Amino acid sequence: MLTDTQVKELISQRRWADIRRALVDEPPPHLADLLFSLETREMVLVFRCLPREVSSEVFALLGKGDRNALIEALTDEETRHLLADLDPDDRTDLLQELPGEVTQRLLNLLSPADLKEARQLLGYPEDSVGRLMTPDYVAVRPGWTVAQALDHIRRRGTDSETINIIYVTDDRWKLLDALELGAFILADPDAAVRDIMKGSFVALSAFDDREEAVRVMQRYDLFVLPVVDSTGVLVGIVTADDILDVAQEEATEDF
Amino acid sequence: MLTDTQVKELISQRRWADIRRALVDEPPPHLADLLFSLETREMVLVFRCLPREVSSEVFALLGKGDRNALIEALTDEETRHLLADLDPDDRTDLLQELPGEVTQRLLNLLSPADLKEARQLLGYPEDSVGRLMTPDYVAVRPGWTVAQALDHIRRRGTDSETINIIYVTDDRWKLLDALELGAFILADPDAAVRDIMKGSFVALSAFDDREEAVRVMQRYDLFVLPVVDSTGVLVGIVTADDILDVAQEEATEDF
Ligand SMILES: [Mg+2]
Ligand SMILES: [Mg+2]
Ligand SMILES: [Mg+2]
Ligand SMILES: [Mg+2]
Ligand SMILES: [Mg+2]
Ligand SMILES: [Mg+2]
Ligand SMILES: [Mg+2]
Ligand SMILES: [Mg+2]
Ligand SMILES: [Mg+2]
Ligand SMILES: [Mg+2]
Ligand SMILES: [Mg+2]
Ligand SMILES: [Mg+2]
């Protein structure tokens, strides 16, 4: 419960260790509130005090002004480190909102694989599902056993957007099913994944409009939706937290 | 992919078995679409053909007119069976929208424990979180081991709204934490639940406005939120599918 007043005094006293200790374990939304209530110079300073695992989350929560100001201020390495750790859809959201030359130097701060990822995601139309989606889903093969699937989920879990739905893909990565995480812990560990499939699923197109993601998510009452290309290959997922934001970006735009 | 045309012919032929076979494994939203495109007499007839485990889901998806017409038409036992199987928040949604004497005979069709449940949930203010919430969450004790928690989740899973977040409560059922299901499958089965708690959580009040559920869910990017009473006792949960509906009931009401 550290206030704008207490941080600004600690800054004035150059009590940098006390600041970093005071920021430990604060929820990212609460850190985003503090950074907003600060003035630009101190907001930039407190942001750099954060561990990079925290500051990437907080960055995604900031307003456009604070976000843009913060981009105008961090160094090349600090920026490079934010772009690496941002979730791919959050990385896209920044690049579509920034001016061209700024997005372009940002792009040059990405690693080759991250450049290819970011290039692909910005390449879907604006207001498309492809541009809302993240490729950090967890997928399993139909021929794996449930125990093997569970070891894959455990290895890959925290590095991924969500594990609450697990996707099944074939060898050519085409989407076969969408399974709740619970199905794997209710099932017999020696059963194949194919034993717990129903073979029916809802999926979006990457070229769907963002509002279709809202309509489809309301229709089927799911918290995550897979996105497939024209051949049925799984290319990413969209999650309910981002879809709720779309619902009220689109709602106010109607007003 | 059974159409309004094919069902109406089967009805005219009195091919009731063929109808029940044609409805097997159709997603509830697709059944709700078919029932809407029908006329009232056939919609009521096809609804009764459904297994009660299906028809309860479909009922929650229907429009107010079709829903109300269907209440005017099912028998006392058929109504009794719908009210039992409806999720408690979906049961509330029907009772707050129906006229008084109709809600009152409905109430008399409930079992004692279901009457006490429904009475309590309608007793929160209209437009409150209490009236959005369902008590069908899954909770564990902090002193249980992860293996014991996992057996409780398995016993209680499909009878509950979601298992994607598991709540920790003490002996007096006060909320101690909110844990992702993944935490239990990553953890050592012999660890206590208290070993995987962080002891911090977001919770709503039952007397919060429905729009606060929207604001809090957007703020913390969660798919489920617990609801606590003034003493901190867990009383229910709200889920993102219902909150997305609130967001656009409230959005259009602004327009
Ligand atoms: Mg994110
Ligand atoms: Mg548009
Ligand atoms: Mg990555
Ligand atoms: Mg819905
Ligand atoms: Mg996201
Ligand atoms: Mg519009
Ligand atoms: Mg429901
Ligand atoms: Mg209101
Ligand atoms: Mg019940
Ligand atoms: Mg949010
Ligand atoms: Mg519900
Ligand atoms: Mg309003």
Automatic annotation (TrEMBL), chains A, B:
Q: Which UniProt keywords apply?
A: Metal-binding
Q: Any idea which positions bind Mg(2+) 2? A: D89, E161, D242
Positions bound to Mg(2+) 1: D87, D90
Residues bound to Mg(2+) 4: E253, D254
For binding Mg(2+) 3, which residues are annotated in this chain's numbering?
A: Q218, D221, D245
At the top level, the lineage of the source is Bacteria
User: What is the protein name stated in its UniProt record?
Assistant: Magnesium transporter
Q: Which organism is it from?
A: Clostridiales bacterium
The beginning of the lineage is: Bacteria, Bacillati, Bacillota, Clostridia, Eubacteriales
Q: Complete protein: which residues are present?
A: 1 to 255 of 442
